[PDB]
Symmetry: D3
Amino acid sequence: VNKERTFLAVKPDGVARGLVGEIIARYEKKGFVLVGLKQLVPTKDLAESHYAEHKERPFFGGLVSFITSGPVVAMVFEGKGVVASARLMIGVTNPLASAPGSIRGDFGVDVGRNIIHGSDSVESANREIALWFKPEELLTEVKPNPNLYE
Amino acid sequence: VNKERTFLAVKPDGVARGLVGEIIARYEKKGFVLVGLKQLVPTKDLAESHYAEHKERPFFGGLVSFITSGPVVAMVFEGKGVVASARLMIGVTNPLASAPGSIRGDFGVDVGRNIIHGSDSVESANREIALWFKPEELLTEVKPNPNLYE
Amino acid sequence: VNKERTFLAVKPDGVARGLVGEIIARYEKKGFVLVGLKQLVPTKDLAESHYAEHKERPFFGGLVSFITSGPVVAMVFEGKGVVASARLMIGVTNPLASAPGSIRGDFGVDVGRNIIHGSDSVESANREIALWFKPEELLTEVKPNPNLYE
Amino acid sequence: VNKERTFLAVKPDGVARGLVGEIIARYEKKGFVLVGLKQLVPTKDLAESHYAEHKERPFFGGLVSFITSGPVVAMVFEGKGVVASARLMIGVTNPLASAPGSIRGDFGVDVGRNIIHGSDSVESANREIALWFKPEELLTEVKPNPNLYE
Amino acid sequence: VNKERTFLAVKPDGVARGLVGEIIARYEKKGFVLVGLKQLVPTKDLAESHYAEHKERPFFGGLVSFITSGPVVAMVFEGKGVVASARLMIGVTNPLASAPGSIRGDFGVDVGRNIIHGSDSVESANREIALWFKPEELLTEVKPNPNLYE
Amino acid sequence: VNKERTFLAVKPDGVARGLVGEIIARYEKKGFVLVGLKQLVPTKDLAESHYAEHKERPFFGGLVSFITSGPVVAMVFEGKGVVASARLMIGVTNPLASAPGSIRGDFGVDVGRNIIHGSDSVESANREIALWFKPEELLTEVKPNPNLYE
């Protein structure tokens, strides 16, 4: 189904490095539809909720701290297979190991400064979308380019 | 002063043509700081307020209609001379007459589908920013790259 | 040998999405030589001949229909290992699974709208070239950049 | 009117320098529709006919010689104001004087190697199109992106 | 004549902002030949000599200070009309007033952080080249692409 | 550690094809710091020393010959994991087999004309750096973007 959504957040390092438009352009080119978009400085509450899966790990504190250290551009993209496809376009956790062509492969060097977050599953996408966005902030009717889908 | 702001809105044709990231990237490269960013489908009220200067002209109706016909990515950029600089980067009203290199010069062909709005003056910028954004939606402290300003 | 040729066709979705020049540029950059190039709207006959290998499958009809639904930019590129290299630059059948960096990895989302055709073998290349092009439409003498080949 | 056409030919220097896709991409991005496209090595007859306006000047011989010295990618683009717009995107006769952003401004250095030809008027466009293309080689029905024209 | 040379230096702001390759690529694309290239941190002596024309102005101190504050990538490019052409590709002193398409028009916002230096005349080019480079650091025989010059 | 260095040399084919800036830009974007940079035409001595590992193989002569056949842009980049990361960004020995996205995957077609050299190990990097550069030619203090490293 073509109404799958994923959550992506350009983290404060990616925003600070002027990569917001380069990243959005990659997903627009791919044919995914921008369905929500805003810049914000995450609060502590949202951050801990965002990273709640790690909350028993020692590196949780660092994650929460970093993501609330500056502006973040949160976005929701819609399309077929968007959750896995967007991960593939991101690269792997370690930017040094991410293939050239991928966002982290092209732009990143350090795990802790790896530019962008993308949901790792449809279920984490749905939780993250409902976390970061109000329903009113999301397009209800989406029309993609007619040349994208059969 | 380096805290000048302008309002830009990628209009629904620019959003539909997948130009959002290409446009944001141009301003990020230039060194202007993203200070507000959201996607929305303008209501009639906001549109008529946005285009209130034309409200006695016959083409007002068309402007209001078009801009509420689909999603718009509204953004506020901060920097020295950003209001005039952003206009220059946009091109002139008619895309056909806009120099190659400019957004409308590179991407547009028709006055009525000219992709992007930018404030034409600091005073229209301030009015437009206060129209489209809540104060809470705007970064209060902005840090540009230190290599941009003397 | 450096006179290997492959057949590529930007299908009507890739032409409609404005990707013709982006695709040709990728092969020119690589150092492959454009040896034939034309836009056409395939007839039914050429399409069924092009897809003759699938003619006993149920999806044959859809292939023939789609490719004759609009303009196609057919081209022949020459170079060492061009048939396999051009496939690699294309990606795999499913665009969602194609690596970032590849044409389908960068631009596509749906199997049925996967932008471009490339010959899958030298023998299918030779058949396809002889199908889509007259001999007179192909450069006989090709000179590549001297800095490409040892 | 939106059915205006112009003739462009990437001359043999632009083809030899691998600029065919970069040039086509610029016009596709702009929103002009590719309406005819082929590679050919011009004969003497076509060249002298193409440059017939100069035929009483001494530099006519050089023009005819150069353009028949190698492959040329001839194309016809359709759109509103395409004849003047395409010239603007090309630059001026001397590449050294052409603004950055324009094809000749970005890529050229010498008048005699200035990459690309574009019709200088609708009437020279119509003559050139009818010269270089058969009617059957041109799309009869053109659909642009709906987001281009009001 | 095609052996004209100009001196360009990516100043420490352009080096710090990761613009070295973007700038070199613009001149390579244009068809100018790289004839000398090195990174260095200018000493005070070289800086004051470089900016000797301003030495009676109050802003001389700031120029010398800034250029010795970090690495600089000095380069010499060769080509027809390269001195004026390279200036045109740079833009004007004030980046805010430089046309989109030009280096300063695309990337700069502040006079004091305007990214790049280019010789303003053949005579200042010759003085600057002899200042920043040893003769042994410069290619003696230059071959451009044969498709650049008539 | 973030002070790892690698040696890269754009070989004479990559310099002749105008790829110097495209290659430097890829590493700058990645966040690696340019720590040394110069153009030179390698002598025989440096070449044989550079390729000393192959000196008992028959193809040694060809390597030495090619690399001294024209200008080379030698550079040293600094960053975490830069030696392996830079190899990954290069591709594999055979350009035809290198993934799209990588330098050799995007630009190369022939093993003997594969554009660029990168150290294959920290130890070969250290030997190569000390070969091609004087200590004075290398930045001693390097500051990367603060948004790159945790």
